Amino acid sequence: SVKSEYAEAAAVGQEAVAVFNTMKAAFQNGDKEAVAQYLARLASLYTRHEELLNRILEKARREGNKEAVTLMNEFTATFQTGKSIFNAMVAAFKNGDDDSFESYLQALEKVTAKGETLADQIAKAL
């Protein structure tokens, strides 16, 4: 069902949370080789998550599930805020700008924390 597809999407999201925290530890420790690898892993995970989310939103639309569509339109918008911040973070890493990397990292954490009550609301709406 769309509900089990959302649980699968939620797990991919939690995987990115896990890798992100390991990445934050590596950044603080100065292990740039590790950070580079974790950033590649996160890019792939976010690409996957975004794709599942779109398939969930399109399915909710075809199902006429107006409330789920409303919530998923909001949630995908916020996902794109996180994605833009992540991409800027990756650029800061390429550029050697640890000040910008720190800023983007904290922002990406707060955008993720904010978007969690909605993530739970979608599970219940589908």
Ligand X SMILES: O=C(O)c1cc2cc(Cl)sc2[nH]1
Q: Identify which of 49, 54, 58, 115 has the alpha carbon closest to the alpha carbon of residue 81.
A: 115
**List 72, 108, 122, 126, residue binding ligand X (CB under 6 A):** 108
Contact 118, 75 (CB under 8 A): yes
Segment contacting ligand X by CB under 6 A, of 1-9, 25-33, 55-63, 83-91: 83-91
Tokens of 65: 């599930």
Query: What one-character-per-residue DSSP string does 5-37 give?
Result: HHHHHHHHHHHHHHHHHHHHHHHHHT-HHHHHH
- Scan residues 33-72 and list those touching ligand X (CB under 6 A): 46, 50
Q: How near is the Cβ of 90 to ligand X at its closest, in Å? A: 9
**List 6, 38, 75, 79, residue binding ligand X (CB under 6 A):** 79
Pick 57 or 82: Cβ nearer ligand X: 82
Contact 54, 46 (CB under 8 A): no
Segment contacting ligand X by CB under 6 A, of 32-40, 54-62, 68-76, 104-112: 104-112
Q: Considering CB under 6 A, how many residues would be counted as binding ligand X?
A: 10
User: Could you say which DSSP state residue 96 is in?
Assistant: T
The residues binding ligand X (CB under 6 A) are 46, 50, 79, 82-83, 86-87, 108, 111-112
